[PDB]
């Protein structure tokens, strides 16, 4: 798929068919937000004290 | 020996102090003021009125609480807000409890 | 003195003159950070 398609939120489901499965179909989903460990934005200000 | 200077219950500041003791010598002990603030991360401008949106600003004036709105709920006093409940054509004005297990009747 | 002048960090020396002093004067300097270095133990928990 194109990169711009991956940037937009798409399910892009993967379907696997097999006789040994109970329901015979396995579905998995993935997108840009799949995984993505939490990003921290610590923007701390400390020079306003100016030594009391 | 930790001494508690002040403690605002609904702000959850817990300003404390202790004098750490080193070996006996001319005074080099480190005086410390120890605070423990619990930010809610989900409370509103009124913790009682649900209509107000999420509050981003977190204001902590130490001198103001050492001597009004606050962020943390209390376990002792009750927070009751008036809420509408409707059955049919008419409506009845009823009370509610914002948080459970805090001040339930005994 | 005004507090704004204190916040500027002047010398603010107190010259004390006496006969018993070897140099007949003695002064000390106060400043905004004239005391302890004031190291901070600041911590931020995100549990
Ligand atoms: C958001 O906070 C304000 C703070 O003043 C509250 O308004 C009054 O709060 C007192 C406190 O119990 C009530 O007795 C009054 O009835 C409230 N005023 C009104 C008009 O309800 C209130 O918690 C919130 N503000 C509003 C407009 O609901
Ligand atoms: C991270 O913090 C910096 C500094 O405040 C800010 O400029 C930047 O936009 C932040 N990034 C985000 C919120 O994704
Ligand atoms: C600060 O450090 C001292 C150890 O010197 C500790 O006893 C105290 O509990 C600490 N303060 C807080 C708020 O944990
Ligand atoms: C901050 O500085 C003090 C001064 O030495 C030190 O004892 C303390 O452990 C430091 N904090 C951390 C997280 O290292
Ligand atoms: C604060 O400083 C003391 C040094 O006396 C250190 O033992 C302690 O771990 C520090 N507190 C921290 C790192 O939270």
Swiss-Prot record, chain B:
First-to-last residue of the parent protein present: 26 to 159 of 159
Subunit structure: Part of the secretory IgA (sIgA) complex that consists of two, four or five IgA monomers, and two additional non-Ig polypeptides, namely the JCHAIN and the secretory component (the proteolytic product of PIGR). Part of the secretory IgM (sIgM) complex that consists of five IgM monomers, and two additional non-Ig polypeptides, namely the JCHAIN and the secretory component (the proteolytic product of PIGR). JCHAIN-containing IgM interacts (via CH4 domain) with FCRM (via Ig-like domain).
Location in or out of the cell: Secreted
Gene Ontology CC terms: blood microparticle; dimeric IgA immunoglobulin complex; extracellular exosome; extracellular region; extracellular space; monomeric IgA immunoglobulin complex; pentameric IgM immunoglobulin complex; secretory dimeric IgA immunoglobulin complex
Keywords from the UniProt entry: Disulfide bond, Glycoprotein, Pyrrolidone carboxylic acid, Secreted, Signal
Protein name per Swiss-Prot or TrEMBL: Immunoglobulin J chain
Sugar attachment sites: 46
GO molecular function annotations of the record: antigen binding; IgA binding; immunoglobulin receptor binding; protein homodimerization activity; protein-macromolecule adaptor activity
Function: Serves to link two monomer units of either IgM or IgA. In the case of IgM, the J chain-joined dimer is a nucleating unit for the IgM pentamer, and in the case of IgA it induces dimers and/or larger polymers. It also helps to bind these immunoglobulins to secretory component.
From Swiss-Prot, chain C:
Protein name (Swiss-Prot/TrEMBL): Immunoglobulin heavy constant mu
Highest taxon of the lineage: Eukaryota
Disease linkage: Agammaglobulinemia 1, autosomal recessive: A primary immunodeficiency characterized by profoundly low or absent serum antibodies and low or absent circulating B cells due to an early block of B-cell development. Affected individuals develop severe infections in the first years of life.
Post-translational modification: N-glycosylated; important for IgM secretion and its localization at the plasma membrane. The interaction with FCMR is glycan-independent.
Its biological purpose: Constant region of immunoglobulin heavy chains. Immunoglobulins, also known as antibodies, are membrane-bound or secreted glycoproteins produced by B lymphocytes. In the recognition phase of humoral immunity, the membrane-bound immunoglobulins serve as receptors which, upon binding of a specific antigen, trigger the clonal expansion and differentiation of B lymphocytes into immunoglobulins-secreting plasma cells. Secreted immunoglobulins mediate the effector phase of humoral immunity, which results in the elimination of bound antigens.
Subunit and interaction comment: The basic structural unit of both sIgM and mIgM molecules consists of two identical heavy chains and two identical light chains; disulfide-linked. N-terminal variable regions of the heavy and light chains form the antigen binding sites, whereas the C-terminal constant regions of the heavy chains interact with immune receptors to mediate effector functions.
Signal sequence extent: none
